[PDB]
């Protein structure tokens, strides 16, 4: 796998773990305001809605 981005996405909070979103941001494409950090996405949270991957802010 290619070494991903590693920047903080400012003013984005992970709805999974309430942490910062560092690296890729996974924004749900169905929910109006739902995001996962790559750690929570990796854990399989919010499975059932397609998310969009934003590597960088
Ligand atoms: Zn998280
Ligand atoms: Zn959703």
Residue numbers in the entry: 115 to 171
Which sentences did the original study use to describe this structure?
Sequestosome 1 (SQSTM1 or p62) mediates cell proliferation, survival, and death through multiple signaling programs, including autophagy and metabolism. Here, we report the structural basis underlying specific recognition of Nt-R substrates by the ZZ domain of p62.
To gain insight into the molecular mechanism by which p62 recognizes Nt-R substrates, we determined the atomic-resolution structure of the p62ZZ-RE complex. We designed and crystallized a chimeric construct containing the Arg-Glu sequence fused via a short linker to the N-terminus of the ZZ domain of p62 (aa 120–171) (hereafter referred to as RE-ZZ). The Nt-R is bound in a highly negatively charged groove lined with the residues D129, N132, D147, and D149 of p62. In addition, the carbonyl group of Arg1 is hydrogen bonded to the backbone amide of I127. The complex is further stabilized through the interactions involving degron’s Glu2. The side chain carboxyl group of Glu2 forms a salt bridge with the guanidinium moiety of R139, which in turn is restrained through electrostatic and hydrogen bonding contacts with D149, whereas the backbone amide of Glu2 donates a hydrogen bond to the carboxyl group of D147.
